[PDB]
């Protein structure tokens, strides 16, 4: 199989290793009590938390419906923090100061106190928001990809510093996910067809069906994490087994729950 190295980043069980829609893949103790928390190794592009009721989840947590999920204002301001603020903050730490923006944001969040907070990096403002609340679905709320969340990036304490190399980001244009069989890339045999107006809607549906750690209930990255979008027939072909090759097909764009809902390569 000549695709093995190239397709490794799409083996989501291995490279991410946790829930995507809801990531609660590890446990940590804070003062004699066991809590679940995000533990996936890849960033989740376009993911945010919808609350319905009229205020962003990146608003600071209340000090409940008054506020959001994020760290409350501190002194000096640890959250939110700009990329350049973080680089200045850590400018004496050669192991941290040159990290990519997402890994930096993850490490920054994890530098607060066993149990390490997840984060969201917003590419719009170039700000890292440490999330005080690690819950992702229930205040009633749910995780989602939305046009408003497009530049948000949901980050666990475990985001690897080489995610650029080993994690999905972009959708693959003119390409269809497949299964390497006997020296040839074959179609995924069974797919679950969801109609979708565009790639974004397909990416949002794959995310909705993807690996989830909320209904000892961990997904470990298993689930409907992939979709082939036929842009001609407007079908989001969703499946739950890892792809092991690509088929060239101008009609398709290959997406994953982790991938950005818009960017193509």
From Swiss-Prot:
Keywords: Disulfide bond, Glycoprotein, Malaria, Membrane, Signal, Transmembrane, Transmembrane helix. The keyword Disulfide bond applies. Disulfide bonds join 42-167, 105-128, 185-245, 202-236. One of its GO terms (cellular component) is membrane. Glycans are attached at residues 54, 151, 248-249. It is found in: Membrane. The keyword Transmembrane helix applies. Its main location: membrane. Belongs to the apicomplexan parasites AMA1 family. This is Apical membrane antigen 1. The chain holds residues 108 to 438 of 622 of the full protein.
């Amino acid at each position: 199989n000549p695709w093995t190295e190239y397709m490794a980043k799409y083996d989501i069980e291995e490279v991410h290793g946790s829930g995507i829609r809801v990531d609660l893949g590890e446990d940590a103790e804070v003062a004699g009590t066991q809590y679940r928390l995000p533990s996936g190794k890849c960033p989740v592009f376009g993911k945010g938390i919808i609350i319905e009721s009229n205020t962003t989840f990146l608003k600071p947590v209340a000090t409940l419906k008054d506020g959001g999920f994020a760290f409350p204002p501190t002194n000096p301001l640890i959250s939110p923090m700009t990329l350049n603020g973080m680089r200045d903050f850590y400018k004496n730490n050669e192991y941290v100061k040159n990290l990519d923006e997402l890994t930096l944001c993850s490490r920054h969040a994890g530098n607060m106190n066993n149990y390490k907070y997840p984060a969201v990096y917003d590419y719009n403002d170039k700000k890292c928001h440490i999330l005080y609340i690690a819950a992702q679905e229930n205040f009633c709320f749910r995780p989602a990809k939305d046009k408003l969340f497009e530049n948000y990036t949901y980050l666990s304490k475990n985001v690897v510093d080489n995610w650029e190399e080993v994690c999905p980001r972009k959708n693959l244009e003119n390409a269809k996910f497949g299964l390497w069989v006997d020296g040839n890339c074959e179609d995924i045999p069974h797919v679950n067809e969801f109609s979708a107006n565009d790639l974004f809607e397909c990416n949002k549906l794959v995310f909705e069906l993807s690996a989830s750690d909320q209904p000892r209930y961990k997904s470990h990255g298993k689930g409907y994490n992939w979709g082939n979008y036929n842009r001609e027939t407007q079908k989001c072909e969703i499946f739950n087994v890892k792809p092991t090759c690509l088929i060239n097909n101008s009609s398709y764009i290959a997406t994953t729950a982790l991938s950005h809902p818009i960017e193509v390569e």
